[PDB]
Write an enzyme that holds these catalytic residues in place. Sequence first.
Site, PDB file in Angstrom:
ATOM      1  N   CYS A  32     -58.908 -55.882  43.321  1.00  0.00           N
ATOM      2  CA  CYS A  32     -57.927 -57.519  43.120  1.00  0.00           C
ATOM      3  C   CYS A  32     -58.013 -57.709  43.972  1.00  0.00           C
ATOM      4  O   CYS A  32     -57.656 -57.804  45.071  1.00  0.00           O
ATOM      5  CB  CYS A  32     -56.769 -57.252  42.471  1.00  0.00           C
ATOM      6  SG  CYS A  32     -55.504 -58.568  42.778  1.00  0.00           S
ATOM      7  N   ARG A  92     -54.722 -59.842  46.196  1.00  0.00           N
ATOM      8  CA  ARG A  92     -53.496 -58.761  46.623  1.00  0.00           C
ATOM      9  C   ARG A  92     -53.117 -59.696  48.057  1.00  0.00           C
ATOM     10  O   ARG A  92     -52.451 -58.840  49.353  1.00  0.00           O
ATOM     11  CB  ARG A  92     -54.370 -57.757  47.794  1.00  0.00           C
ATOM     12  CG  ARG A  92     -54.397 -56.679  46.004  1.00  0.00           C
ATOM     13  CD  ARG A  92     -55.130 -55.437  46.391  1.00  0.00           C
ATOM     14  NE  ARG A  92     -56.748 -55.476  46.512  1.00  0.00           N
ATOM     15  CZ  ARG A  92     -57.092 -54.113  47.437  1.00  0.00           C
ATOM     16  NH1 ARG A  92     -56.607 -52.995  47.777  1.00  0.00           N
ATOM     17  NH2 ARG A  92     -58.457 -54.518  47.601  1.00  0.00           N
ATOM     18  N   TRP A 133     -51.667 -65.434  38.820  1.00  0.00           N
ATOM     19  CA  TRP A 133     -52.477 -66.812  38.531  1.00  0.00           C
ATOM     20  C   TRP A 133     -53.773 -66.466  38.363  1.00  0.00           C
ATOM     21  O   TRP A 133     -54.215 -65.657  38.761  1.00  0.00           O
ATOM     22  CB  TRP A 133     -51.886 -68.105  39.037  1.00  0.00           C
ATOM     23  CG  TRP A 133     -51.891 -67.568  39.868  1.00  0.00           C
ATOM     24  CD1 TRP A 133     -53.256 -67.567  40.989  1.00  0.00           C
ATOM     25  CD2 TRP A 133     -51.322 -67.077  41.689  1.00  0.00           C
ATOM     26  NE1 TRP A 133     -52.845 -67.849  42.607  1.00  0.00           N
ATOM     27  CE2 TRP A 133     -51.699 -66.723  43.120  1.00  0.00           C
ATOM     28  CE3 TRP A 133     -49.302 -66.856  41.161  1.00  0.00           C
ATOM     29  CZ2 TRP A 133     -50.898 -67.187  44.085  1.00  0.00           C
ATOM     30  CZ3 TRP A 133     -49.134 -66.445  42.726  1.00  0.00           C
ATOM     31  CH2 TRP A 133     -49.884 -66.719  43.310  1.00  0.00           C
ATOM     32  N   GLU A 146     -62.633 -65.947  36.597  1.00  0.00           N
ATOM     33  CA  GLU A 146     -62.344 -65.643  34.696  1.00  0.00           C
ATOM     34  C   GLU A 146     -62.869 -66.711  33.447  1.00  0.00           C
ATOM     35  O   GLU A 146     -62.334 -65.783  32.686  1.00  0.00           O
ATOM     36  CB  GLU A 146     -60.595 -64.777  34.993  1.00  0.00           C
ATOM     37  CG  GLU A 146     -60.835 -64.270  36.951  1.00  0.00           C
ATOM     38  CD  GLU A 146     -58.766 -63.932  36.947  1.00  0.00           C
ATOM     39  OE1 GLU A 146     -59.494 -62.159  36.250  1.00  0.00           O
ATOM     40  OE2 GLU A 146     -58.765 -64.244  37.444  1.00  0.00           O
TER      41      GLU A 146
HETATM   42  C1  HEM Z   1     -51.712 -63.561  41.490  1.00  0.00           C
HETATM   43  C2  HEM Z   1     -52.614 -64.412  41.981  1.00  0.00           C
HETATM   44  C3  HEM Z   1     -53.745 -62.861  41.884  1.00  0.00           C
HETATM   45  C4  HEM Z   1     -54.872 -63.095  41.504  1.00  0.00           C
HETATM   46  C5  HEM Z   1     -55.572 -65.157  41.743  1.00  0.00           C
HETATM   47  C6  HEM Z   1     -55.329 -61.939  41.006  1.00  0.00           C
HETATM   48  C7  HEM Z   1     -57.428 -62.383  41.009  1.00  0.00           C
HETATM   49  C8  HEM Z   1     -57.614 -60.930  40.178  1.00  0.00           C
HETATM   50  C9  HEM Z   1     -59.164 -60.786  39.925  1.00  0.00           C
HETATM   51  C10 HEM Z   1     -60.259 -61.613  40.059  1.00  0.00           C
HETATM   52  C11 HEM Z   1     -59.401 -59.855  39.359  1.00  0.00           C
HETATM   53  C12 HEM Z   1     -60.565 -58.385  38.408  1.00  0.00           C
HETATM   54  C13 HEM Z   1     -60.729 -59.077  37.270  1.00  0.00           C
HETATM   55  C14 HEM Z   1     -62.307 -58.475  36.665  1.00  0.00           C
HETATM   56  O1  HEM Z   1     -61.870 -56.878  36.206  1.00  0.00           O
HETATM   57  O2  HEM Z   1     -63.338 -59.283  37.073  1.00  0.00           O
HETATM   58  C15 HEM Z   1     -58.415 -58.480  39.141  1.00  0.00           C
HETATM   59  C16 HEM Z   1     -58.263 -57.200  38.914  1.00  0.00           C
HETATM   60  C17 HEM Z   1     -56.854 -56.895  38.992  1.00  0.00           C
HETATM   61  N1  HEM Z   1     -55.877 -56.164  39.773  1.00  0.00           N
HETATM   62 FE1  HEM Z   1     -55.481 -58.745  40.908  1.00  0.00          FE
HETATM   63  N2  HEM Z   1     -54.703 -61.054  40.538  1.00  0.00           N
HETATM   64  C18 HEM Z   1     -53.325 -61.808  40.988  1.00  0.00           C
HETATM   65  C19 HEM Z   1     -52.366 -60.473  41.189  1.00  0.00           C
HETATM   66  C20 HEM Z   1     -52.334 -59.288  40.738  1.00  0.00           C
HETATM   67  C21 HEM Z   1     -50.775 -58.739  40.526  1.00  0.00           C
HETATM   68  C22 HEM Z   1     -49.639 -59.724  40.333  1.00  0.00           C
HETATM   69  C23 HEM Z   1     -51.283 -57.576  40.266  1.00  0.00           C
HETATM   70  C24 HEM Z   1     -50.319 -56.201  40.313  1.00  0.00           C
HETATM   71  C25 HEM Z   1     -48.834 -56.213  39.906  1.00  0.00           C
HETATM   72  C26 HEM Z   1     -52.086 -57.257  40.487  1.00  0.00           C
HETATM   73  C27 HEM Z   1     -53.110 -56.020  39.962  1.00  0.00           C
HETATM   74  C28 HEM Z   1     -54.298 -56.001  39.755  1.00  0.00           C
HETATM   75  C29 HEM Z   1     -55.159 -55.178  39.111  1.00  0.00           C
HETATM   76  C30 HEM Z   1     -54.569 -53.549  39.317  1.00  0.00           C
HETATM   77  C31 HEM Z   1     -56.419 -54.941  38.934  1.00  0.00           C
HETATM   78  C32 HEM Z   1     -57.863 -54.318  38.028  1.00  0.00           C
HETATM   79  C33 HEM Z   1     -58.170 -53.684  36.884  1.00  0.00           C
HETATM   80  C34 HEM Z   1     -59.541 -53.873  36.557  1.00  0.00           C
HETATM   81  O3  HEM Z   1     -60.362 -53.557  37.058  1.00  0.00           O
HETATM   82  O4  HEM Z   1     -59.847 -55.508  36.884  1.00  0.00           O
HETATM   83  N3  HEM Z   1     -53.266 -58.593  41.017  1.00  0.00           N
HETATM   84  N4  HEM Z   1     -57.511 -59.071  39.972  1.00  0.00           N
HETATM   85  C1  LIG Z   2     -64.256 -57.317  33.246  1.00  0.00           C
HETATM   86  N1  LIG Z   2     -62.912 -58.313  32.408  1.00  0.00           N
HETATM   87  C2  LIG Z   2     -63.206 -57.176  30.887  1.00  0.00           C
HETATM   88  C3  LIG Z   2     -61.902 -57.975  29.975  1.00  0.00           C
HETATM   89  C4  LIG Z   2     -62.945 -55.922  31.349  1.00  0.00           C
HETATM   90  C5  LIG Z   2     -61.447 -55.857  32.014  1.00  0.00           C
HETATM   91  C6  LIG Z   2     -60.632 -54.728  31.874  1.00  0.00           C
HETATM   92  C7  LIG Z   2     -59.170 -54.375  32.057  1.00  0.00           C
HETATM   93  C8  LIG Z   2     -58.406 -53.464  31.873  1.00  0.00           C
HETATM   94  N2  LIG Z   2     -57.728 -52.375  31.505  1.00  0.00           N
HETATM   95  C9  LIG Z   2     -58.687 -55.581  33.036  1.00  0.00           C
HETATM   96  C10 LIG Z   2     -59.358 -56.549  33.400  1.00  0.00           C
HETATM   97  O1  LIG Z   2     -58.799 -58.083  33.807  1.00  0.00           O
HETATM   98  C11 LIG Z   2     -58.389 -57.478  35.370  1.00  0.00           C
HETATM   99  C12 LIG Z   2     -56.750 -58.340  35.752  1.00  0.00           C
HETATM  100  C13 LIG Z   2     -55.855 -57.738  36.185  1.00  0.00           C
HETATM  101  C14 LIG Z   2     -54.730 -58.209  36.568  1.00  0.00           C
HETATM  102  C15 LIG Z   2     -55.273 -59.516  37.549  1.00  0.00           C
HETATM  103  C16 LIG Z   2     -54.467 -60.429  37.039  1.00  0.00           C
HETATM  104  C17 LIG Z   2     -53.317 -60.146  37.248  1.00  0.00           C
HETATM  105  C18 LIG Z   2     -54.418 -61.788  37.402  1.00  0.00           C
HETATM  106  C19 LIG Z   2     -55.740 -62.336  37.522  1.00  0.00           C
HETATM  107  N3  LIG Z   2     -55.077 -63.545  37.255  1.00  0.00           N
HETATM  108  N4  LIG Z   2     -56.569 -61.417  36.903  1.00  0.00           N
HETATM  109  C20 LIG Z   2     -56.181 -59.997  36.289  1.00  0.00           C
HETATM  110  C21 LIG Z   2     -57.627 -59.523  36.573  1.00  0.00           C
HETATM  111  C22 LIG Z   2     -60.694 -57.209  32.933  1.00  0.00           C
END
Ligand code: HEM
Ligand SMILES: CN[C@H](C)Cc1cc(C#N)cc(OCc2ccc3c(C)cc(N)nc3c2)c1
Lengths: 402, 404
Positions: free
Chosen positions: A106, A109, A278, A283
């Site tokens: 993420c 964070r 958000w 993405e």
């Molecule tokens: C508030 C603005 C936030 C932004 C800009 C953001 C951005 C991102 C991005 C770009 C990813 C990678 C997505 C991908 O797989 O390509 C991601 C993954 C992730 N985010 Fe954040 N996020 C936000 C909020 C949060 C919140 C509120 C949580 C949890 C309460 C969170 C937890 C996670 C987790 C657990 C992943 C792992 C999912 C994965 O394996 O891809 N994020 N986030």
């Molecule tokens: C590479 N993209 C494909 C669809 C694979 C993927 C799998 C998972 C899961 N589980 C979660 C995925 O998204 C991660 C994620 C999780 C949370 C997010 C939040 C809270 C915000 C945001 N802008 N992006 C997020 C992105 C993607």
Amino acid sequence: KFPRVKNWEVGSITYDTLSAQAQQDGPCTPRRCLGSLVFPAPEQLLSQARDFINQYYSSIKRSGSQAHEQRLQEVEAEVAATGTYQLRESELVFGAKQAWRNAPRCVGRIQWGKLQVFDARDCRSAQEMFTYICNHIKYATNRGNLRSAITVFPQRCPGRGDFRIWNSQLVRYAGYRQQDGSVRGDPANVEITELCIQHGWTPGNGRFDVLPLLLQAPDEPPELFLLPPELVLEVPLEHPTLEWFAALGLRWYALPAVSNMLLEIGGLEFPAAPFSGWYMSTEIGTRNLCDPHRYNILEDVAVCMDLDTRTTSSLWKDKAAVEINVAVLHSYQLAKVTIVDHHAATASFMKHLENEQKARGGCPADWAWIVPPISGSLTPVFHQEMVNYFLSPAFRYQPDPW
Amino acid sequence: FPRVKNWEVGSITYDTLSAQAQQDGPCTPRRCLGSLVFPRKLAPEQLLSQARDFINQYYSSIKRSGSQAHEQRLQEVEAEVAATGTYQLRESELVFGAKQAWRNAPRCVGRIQWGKLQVFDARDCRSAQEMFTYICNHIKYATNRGNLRSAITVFPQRCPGRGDFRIWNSQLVRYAGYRQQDGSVRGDPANVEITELCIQHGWTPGNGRFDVLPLLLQAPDEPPELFLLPPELVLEVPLEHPTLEWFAALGLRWYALPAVSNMLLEIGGLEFPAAPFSGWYMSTEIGTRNLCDPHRYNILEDVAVCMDLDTRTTSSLWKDKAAVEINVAVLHSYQLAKVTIVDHHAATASFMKHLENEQKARGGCPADWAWIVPPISGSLTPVFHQEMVNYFLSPAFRYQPDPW
Ligand code: HEM
Ligand SMILES: CN[C@H](C)Cc1cc(C#N)cc(OCc2ccc3c(C)cc(N)nc3c2)c1
Ligand code: HEM
Ligand SMILES: CN[C@H](C)Cc1cc(C#N)cc(OCc2ccc3c(C)cc(N)nc3c2)c1
Ligand SMILES: CN[C@H](C)Cc1cc(C#N)cc(OCc2ccc3c(C)cc(N)nc3c2)c1
Ligand SMILES: CN[C@H](C)Cc1cc(C#N)cc(OCc2ccc3c(C)cc(N)nc3c2)c1
Ligand SMILES: [Cl-]
Ligand SMILES: [Cl-]
Ligand SMILES: [Gd]
Ligand SMILES: [Gd]
Ligand SMILES: [Zn+2]
Ligand SMILES: [Zn+2]
Ligand SMILES: [Zn+2]
């Protein structure tokens, strides 16, 4: 004996000492790195509970006090009496936040401290689940001024089935198969769309139909609920200097709300705990719109730009994709719905890395995931070395309930 | 064995080859470290072990496995090492080991060409002057007036004790780096210390910002001595943009020939501290890291300004627009000038082929994901969504400490 890590752009050296606490174990050995992989007792529930408690008290600077000892003896006695335990309200807040803070992939964070934790642990039925979920969306959508929130439904427990949300996100667009082997709508959602129909949904026929929710109660089949359209904020997509763009008829939703992950806190597991933040523009722009088995609009947008699509070397892919990201960012700004761009987000992530070095002596980061999917080296995270590892509390993937 | 998915297709393979990897990585089950630039940091029984390893893969490669002259070699080396503490490679052993080292370079996206590589034997070299002629012939064979050709030239091996032959410079051709009164650098900021050392060894610095350095070539135990490259040997390309007519006015250029000259080639436990190799550029190496990296030439904001983009806010993606055009100028300028270059889409699409090939031939292929995915348009290329295993086979190219 701690990973020396370097920022090459700047010449900075940090030592990730927090990694030495890596509660779990990943897939890399000294013989082979698998870092690019997408998907890598009561004595021990107690050991899992014990440590989490010790963390929570270390945070409020009240470690090893009377109440730390009281809380310890109580949990180990509630597992002894019942086979599990309950977290206090403030232990749920801290746990949910640590699980955001610990999520290696993420980039957002910096904000982890400001998360809003709705406690839905008193929830009882599918119909009530839906109520909590709608509140979540309302609070989080906030008319376009996005707020990060998590709602936690009842923990997994012996003797009772799990609360589960069957949708990967609270808001997802349908995806219908056509006879031509083509998918109308979002091709990633062809499966969840099936499930929705075979449970009674009347399917639309558009590229952006918002799917209903499938909400499963303990030891009960999933029920199909329709989100009120007024609750789902959407952004029509248009380009600021390419007016033919808006006649692509594209649009995206405001709120990214992941609903299929398992939260894990102090040994206890919450299979249903939808969280949302958000969007980062890449993405929607690169992943959702450009990927060949997503909406796949790259060549089409390029033809309209009169780029030479006959040859790689013209870089038509790269040009068209920059403009698509531009349209995304301009659309969200116009509609006054929060968005962050990959430069801003990676810039903030670097500060997060600095905050965590002072706070916890390090930070779990998955380089391949932190670096945005376009313009890699133009961002500061690119030339930063990172240590990926696993901490608790955490968000985990879980298998689909079918 | 590692089950590895191509999420763009869903195809699955098992990487059985990774089971042969010796030299351990920096990763443990508790922490991944595959983003570190230098993973592996920086006694006749040990030499003999590797030596036999390498003699055995050679003979299996040519089908005729074992028996034959295989027994002789082993004994030859057994006799050789017992005698002198080391051994010599046959020239064919050297050509073989040369290609394999390329084929096992996990970070190299240009590995499809691994079977076409020109090996020059220079193990009979004795002086620095002889080195210079050897290198000049390399640059010449390699440059070929713009139709580039894969080649490597190997110098004598590390004899036990005593100094080694060693190219001080990172590449055969590089641009100088000059400091000044503010703290800024003129030319290439990555080459300051080699420019630092050329000056304080007898060079004469220059006016502008694309001064081609000399070579600090070293002979065993004798200190290094500079050699001035004949300026017709060094083929450069002025950079112009197809449409943006003002681009050429920026006075930018890049040399044709990427020729790394500071890595170490180990074959069968024989380490060659001097072994310059060269291929042709991938366009993003020039347009993205060399021209756009903050502490390289860093031309991004100058180009954006001329394109009349808004540099006040990140959300105009000006950084991203400018970058794309610089790469367009790189490509067009190498093509007009009839010099070989490959765009990052062509290269990655052919790296995938290579992966398909290597699966059938050896059941795997060590690849470093963070180095295979190009530095821009990452997710737009077919390598991005392709899972990879990283590991270390031998023979290899390895980093070594600098001579200072
Ligand atoms: C508030 C603005 C936030 C932004 C800009 C953001 C951005 C991102 C991005 C770009 C990813 C990678 C997505 C991908 O797989 O390509 C991601 C993954 C992730 N985010 Fe954040 N996020 C936000 C909020 C949060 C919140 C509120 C949580 C949890 C309460 C969170 C937890 C996670 C987790 C657990 C992943 C792992 C999912 C994965 O394996 O891809 N994020 N986030
Ligand atoms: C590479 N993209 C494909 C669809 C694979 C993927 C799998 C998972 C899961 N589980 C979660 C995925 O998204 C991660 C994620 C999780 C949370 C997010 C939040 C809270 C915000 C945001 N802008 N992006 C997020 C992105 C993607
Ligand atoms: C012929 C076309 C070639 C192309 C297009 C090519 C391309 C590349 C690229 C883009 C990198 C990554 C650069 C970086 O990020 O630092 C790389 C790395 C590397 N290549 Fe190749 N290469 C080619 C030929 C060769 C040859 C002929 C050899 C050896 C004989 C070779 C061996 C290596 C090695 C050892 C690396 C290690 C990464 C590093 O040290 O930076 N390649 N190549
Ligand atoms: C989730 N439902 C969708 C349909 C599954 C999927 C589709 C596509 C595509 N196209 C690509 C997918 O791969 C995601 C992926 C794979 C590898 C990645 C690597 C190595 C790094 C990174 N940052 N993201 C990756 C993201 C998955
Ligand atoms: C990963 N290694 C770290 C980044 C050190 C390094 C720095 C530089 C520079 N400047 C240049 C470096 O080499 C890159 C390289 C090496 C060989 C190449 C070959 C053989 C061909 C080609 N077209 N590009 C190469 C590019 C390495
Ligand atoms: C090359 N010689 C100079 C003096 C050192 C250097 C400078 C800069 C810059 N600006 C950027 C540098 O980047 C090195 C680097 C670091 C990490 C990388 C990762 C994680 C991946 C990748 N593909 N290349 C990297 C390249 C190095
Ligand atoms: Cl999404
Ligand atoms: Cl270079
Ligand atoms: Gd227009
Ligand atoms: Gd103008
Ligand atoms: Zn993708
Ligand atoms: Zn690893
Ligand atoms: Zn770079």
